[PDB]
Symmetry: D2
Subunit: 497 residues, 4 copies
Amino acid sequence: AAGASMQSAANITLRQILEPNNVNLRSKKTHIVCTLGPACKSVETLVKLIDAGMDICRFNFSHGSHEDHKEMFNNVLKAQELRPNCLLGMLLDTKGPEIRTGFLKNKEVHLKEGSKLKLVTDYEFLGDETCIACSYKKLPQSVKPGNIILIADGSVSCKVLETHEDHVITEVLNSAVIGERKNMNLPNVKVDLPIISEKDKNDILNFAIPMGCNFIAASFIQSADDVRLIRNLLGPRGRHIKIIPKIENIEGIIHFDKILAESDGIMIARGDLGMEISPEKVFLAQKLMISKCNLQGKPIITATQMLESMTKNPRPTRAEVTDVANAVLDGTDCVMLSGETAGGKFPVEAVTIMSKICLEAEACIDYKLLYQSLVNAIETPISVQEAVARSAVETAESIQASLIIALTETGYTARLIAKYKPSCTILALSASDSTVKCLNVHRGVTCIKVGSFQGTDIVIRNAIEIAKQRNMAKVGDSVIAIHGIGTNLMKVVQIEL
Amino acid sequence: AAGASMQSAANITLRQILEPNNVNLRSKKTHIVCTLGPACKSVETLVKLIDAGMDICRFNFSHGSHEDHKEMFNNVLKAQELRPNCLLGMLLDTKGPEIRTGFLKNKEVHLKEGSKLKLVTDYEFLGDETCIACSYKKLPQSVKPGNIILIADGSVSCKVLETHEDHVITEVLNSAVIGERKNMNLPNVKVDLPIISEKDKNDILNFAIPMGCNFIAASFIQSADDVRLIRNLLGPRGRHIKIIPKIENIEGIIHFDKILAESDGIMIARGDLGMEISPEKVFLAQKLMISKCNLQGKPIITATQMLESMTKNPRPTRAEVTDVANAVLDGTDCVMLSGETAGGKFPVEAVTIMSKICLEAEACIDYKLLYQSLVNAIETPISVQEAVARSAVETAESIQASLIIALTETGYTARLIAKYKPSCTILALSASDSTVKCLNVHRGVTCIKVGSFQGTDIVIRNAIEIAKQRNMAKVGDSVIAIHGIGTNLMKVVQIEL
Amino acid sequence: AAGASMQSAANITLRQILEPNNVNLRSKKTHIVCTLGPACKSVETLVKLIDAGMDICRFNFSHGSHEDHKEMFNNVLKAQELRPNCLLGMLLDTKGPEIRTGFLKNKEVHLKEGSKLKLVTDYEFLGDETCIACSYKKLPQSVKPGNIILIADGSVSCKVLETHEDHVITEVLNSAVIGERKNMNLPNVKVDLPIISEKDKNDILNFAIPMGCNFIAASFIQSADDVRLIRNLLGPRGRHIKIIPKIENIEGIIHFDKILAESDGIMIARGDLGMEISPEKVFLAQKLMISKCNLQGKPIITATQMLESMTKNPRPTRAEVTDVANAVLDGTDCVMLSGETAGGKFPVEAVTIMSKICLEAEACIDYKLLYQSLVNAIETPISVQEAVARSAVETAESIQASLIIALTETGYTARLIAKYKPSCTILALSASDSTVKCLNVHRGVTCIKVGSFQGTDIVIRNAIEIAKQRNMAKVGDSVIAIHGIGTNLMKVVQIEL
Amino acid sequence: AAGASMQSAANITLRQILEPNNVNLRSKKTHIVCTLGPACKSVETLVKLIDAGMDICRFNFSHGSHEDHKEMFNNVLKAQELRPNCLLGMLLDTKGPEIRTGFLKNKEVHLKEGSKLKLVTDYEFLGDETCIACSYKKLPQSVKPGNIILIADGSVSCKVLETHEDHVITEVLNSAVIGERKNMNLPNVKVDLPIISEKDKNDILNFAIPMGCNFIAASFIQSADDVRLIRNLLGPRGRHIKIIPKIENIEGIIHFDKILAESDGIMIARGDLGMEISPEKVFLAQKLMISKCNLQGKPIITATQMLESMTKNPRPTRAEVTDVANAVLDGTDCVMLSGETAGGKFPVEAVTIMSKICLEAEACIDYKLLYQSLVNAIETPISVQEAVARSAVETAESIQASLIIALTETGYTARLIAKYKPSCTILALSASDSTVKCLNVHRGVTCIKVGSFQGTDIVIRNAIEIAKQRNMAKVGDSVIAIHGIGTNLMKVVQIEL
Ligand SMILES: [K+]
Ligand SMILES: [K+]
Ligand SMILES: [K+]
Ligand SMILES: [K+]
Ligand SMILES: [Mg+2]
Ligand SMILES: [Mg+2]
Ligand SMILES: [Mg+2]
Ligand SMILES: [Mg+2]
């Protein structure tokens, strides 16, 4: 419940402001999660997204049937075949628990500020301006007098006056018009609904596991026990699938340290979170959560409305540009697009400008000062493995190495290096198909699948050759190689011939 | 052309995320410039804006007659009378030089990507999809082949192919529909139009000076000579009016150091600036300009689209919230609202949430580390005056003083203190009506008018009494008093009785 | 029991190594305590000592009658009359408790390593190589088997084998010859003898108080209660006399924090201390005690064998030069001469080279880094008085002020400034005769007596005039003035006319 | 001509002051050069010196025949045979150029202050109190009026009044008695005598090279060309012999940077240097030279009068203790004993206490802060080799490794590690007999001879086994291994079985 959030020290020159950036968009360090939807169902669009900087594909299971998502998944596989050097991570976002209003007698009601509104748990009641149903049966046992209830993306706020067994009575706090089946939020209240419904269970056990998804973004995580429940559900079958809790309400913030301990990474669901804490507090939660994830070496995705005005316009606002840029400078591993790619009119443009902003933000980071801030903020007894990973980053910066090459079966070594944020690419070499796609969630890590049961030096030399072929390294460069993470080893190789 | 931009180190606690802020909105340090328009012409609205955190009123002279602005000005004076403790600064924003397209034969044209378009300097030609007039007579002598011309808020880009004496021939780079008399931008080209037209001259000499405006925001400043031209035009009559250059294009960025040297402060016109440099570079210019202004002790206003989605919605996006917050953490003195207050549907809501975001951002600043970053970055031989101002800030932080009280005729002393960013309010005491309204542009400075020819100790004691009455200080607090800025003096007073 | 001892960061140039220092020896910051003796009983010698840098005169009451010391004291007063601008502090060093061997049948004994030696408490027994008397009657109750007893300046060590009621039996650990009535030490044993004997009581009540001594250096302080006993003995009559405990054994080191809390300053009796802890540990105790005294703002005197080889030679060894220099860089307020001035053949030469070494050491101190080390190491809530004293030092360094002028009745203000180690002289102005001589123990403080019941500005202006006359300041210099230490005040004055 | 000399930050606890140190004296990091003489000609004494901490044997060729030194050398070899794990470096100190007075008619003269003295170049003239011969034939062409001439260890100073072709006329500046053939010094004058005389040539070519000496300490180096002359004289035959210039006068200080560039290390001849610069300046030259050698990674020996009072007493003074201790904290690689071991009465005691002081000083060094001071002070583009050596030191500190094992043919790798001052021992493994004895001059490096043409892993494993047998490492320890210094490699090994 305390974080000394420190920005990456920035160095900004006139040259960077004035000279065009002409580097490959996939050379960026920050990775992009793209939500798939009708606006990018074509294989042609998906290849264009790949070329624009897409690294992780998000399947939002709040909507759509398994066949709708399976058809999208298969078109992703074809795009993957035409871009075999750009291995994409596959992320399933659970629908999770929802609270909705009921139906209305005349399809719409005009709630008046000052008036009073009854919220009943009989979801079959046709509502009017005086009384509306709520799908959350335990609403009356969850809210207390004085609690605030938000309806329809927070367009209406209601103050709980009385609670009874099958209904609650509120005061409407502002006037607004609302329709049927609108979302509801219960700020500062723990929601007593299953983190994983049978619907969610089916999506995980019969889509995520069989289709080979790499991440589960678990909507509305409120406790470390929610994470353990999902881990147990995945079982040995899904044990290589990473669980990424979505922090969406005050419970998730209160228990963040313990949620993060059980997790493989975090997604900041900023939109939903702004309907539980006040909007002006969301930037504080973003910066605190990013800083805590940085300190633990756990990857974090910043999500929701980073380029929202791009759902219609081909260029973003000045605020959205700094939002993406500052999330990078804050220390995020990934940034996210939702409607900008799933349904908007400029999906390729959105990913393209997002990649360009990331490149500009990354270019101004002071990496020697970033490194020292991390080193000074981490507990003093570190493991041998972490100290060697640390020395790879240090050494690379001191000699201006073009690559750190990490040989890693589980990904552990590459994650330890990524924790210390080197200015050069981390090239992770793994014989695990899972590891090679799971490491995408970490800033600055690119992976190559290699064969099992190979000599370490053969693998490193093969990797250096591939790196040359991909213009990731050239003759006369130094590269760091780290492996064995009992002998943990750091070596420096000059690229010759 | 080099700035080691460093964020204010932030400290974020769970308490700040979760507990409501219940302090007066006018207690914030960051000041708000509000653009006046039809959406806030009522005296009732203007008083509501004052209470919501408005500190400087912007009169945008791009539109409106002197009588339209004079009627607004007089309604401001009445609002000022009902809020006599909230002295507002008055800012005139010059129309300045503009470039517009001409008229169209059928009111609209559909420009097709790949096609070619002739831009003529005969502003009387009725245009079609092949040929359109431009109001800038020296366009052909200003652009060269390869230059890019933006039309209609950058919705169309054109590449200059040929230049001739009275026209230019371009290639349309993307398809779009455009109307009549649309704005144009000439990225990376110096615009050879008068910084101050006879229209601008009339507004300055016959509105700003007579009506008693405190700032001129000079649109489209491209050089230090533009500033000197305006200073000379103001003459001895307007010598107390501060000139705030608006940085809007690449010329302004290239010559920023010399523009800043001649200026009293800077406004970042981010919207217009994003149509001259690439959008993804605007955040770099913002952070560089804020950091350079901080280092010089010159005040800076961050302007354009900070809460743009609020022109229609009563709540902002997640990106706009971080934009306002990060501009504060960047080190801006003021933030600005344009259409959000002049024409939008939620002017009071916009100022209100802007003030709340500022309060949240200011609360997480680490002030001891902010101070040390400034001290370490400033040239080593400082004046006696600056060293005493420095010691007031240091001393206040060390004893947790509630106020620094600065007695200052010109404002110079208060500006030196503001340069070092104390965590407590700076209460500037001046017998100058001009100084008392001009200091509003500096973060954290509040002013009180006092009588001339008074003993220093009488003034300080009167100020402490007024501070108690305004709940800015209480019995048992320490306050710093600084004056004489040859004997420069810092004293610490405990509040008793 | 923990100190992060940090040297003053040093800056050493070739110019300082090669160019002669031609400044007044009394301009140094480090002050010199000189032990008075037959080698400097002449008024002519004492004036020469003053001119060579003597600041405090030590009267060692281990030897001499009151008339011997009174005759010396009166000759000091005459030297003082011929140097009226060089006010000297007067320090009485108590004989305190001693432990001595007894008499010997044939005046000498040869103790053989491995043999055994009986130490009896009948001080009348004439001793031989097998059995020698000890003046400490409770020796057998103080030492335990395994304790080490040192005899004759540590030339013989003995291991306690058995203890009985009136004697102890030891093993001689090395061979040596010893005479009669030699000193003894009991390492790691608390000595149960009165801190103040009737002899010491007489010297304090009938010499120190009547003659107007400014300091009592209390030999062999072992506890905070020893200090309180001396404070009570001084009573209201001697309440302005400062108590300077001499740390001489392990008890004093163990209880150092609590001894320092009750004290006005510390003297490191390094010679005696090296006969209680191992010689190779004395430098650790020196650096720890100096650093703890620096942190508390209490003055410390480093004493014993700093220029010992000068008792006979006119030039010191390379080790003695670094010893004086490093004690300065360690942070000592004063350095001390004992036999080098009281009995040696080169008293004037010794003080002269000591002053020169101090000047060289002080010149290489990095004062901005010294200040920051102190500031970073002191508890975060400081008083108003300390913060203003701090700001005087800061401000002086930033503007290169030639003087900090402190108006102070008790000396408190001047001590707070001295704690932060300014590079310029601290000129303390006091109407107290006691304060004006007591502040001599603080590095870098020079005092001027002023009249009582004077306006502050009259006093400061008079002080500036005197400073000009003494070439401590010149026209065009800045000086800091601090007083009122409820209004505490710091002012900067430029010297004109 | 500028060094920001910074002490090693020290941490001093009560435990270190009070608890005895019971570790092996040869476990210290600082190495001891012992001057061999009649006081330690016995093989029994030399073995005792080894056990007390002697690391380098100094043969002072200012005195003695080749047979005298050869007999000593052979007795060293026998002591070496009885201590085969303690490989000693062999250092030849050249007589070099000397200036002496002539003979006297009555064996002694009493020079009177104020009188005048003629110094003639006819070395055959029998001198009196008015006229004395000088062995330096070019004296009159080297000194100018105003130069100071020192005679007989600086006991007499003379001011040059006139120079003529075969004599100089001086004024005696102080009275003293002098004998025949006394040393002379010419402060601030370059001495035009051969750095290497035929006598010195014979000692180098017919003792140092044939007997296998590892270092030449070249007395009275005044320029980089002196070093190059010695390097050329050594030729390919002596190319593995390190040249250690002795800095002894102002010329050596002025040209120190260029002398150091050509050198393998530095010896500070403090005694002789105090007769060329003022005594109070010698500590400045010591700290500057140590700091410059630290920054370059060149080893430095601090020499002369560190424990001088031990030539007669069995315990040192308080000043000599801090002198040894502060030279360690200053950053010296070696400390030196001259008469304390060659002729004194307590040679074993002197080395013993010197080792103990070194241990105490080394124990209080803050190594993380020492490392950061070095890293921050070294030029930013370092080699791959230096960055890997750096990472070994970093990694060792972070995991608390017990050893850094460096495989090195030339010693280069071990010197790069030693430059960064690890808190653990550096165990250098070399197949070079020369390297294994030359690395002794570097603080904290211990060597083991290994066979040529061995696999790296076999060597490291053999070294770990030997380290266990010598109690330098135990099961459960981590050790760093570094080799290959194109692939430079750092590995961490845990000690098992
Ligand atoms: K979802
Ligand atoms: K305008
Ligand atoms: K005494
Ligand atoms: K020699
Ligand atoms: Mg949600
Ligand atoms: Mg514009
Ligand atoms: Mg004593
Ligand atoms: Mg010599």
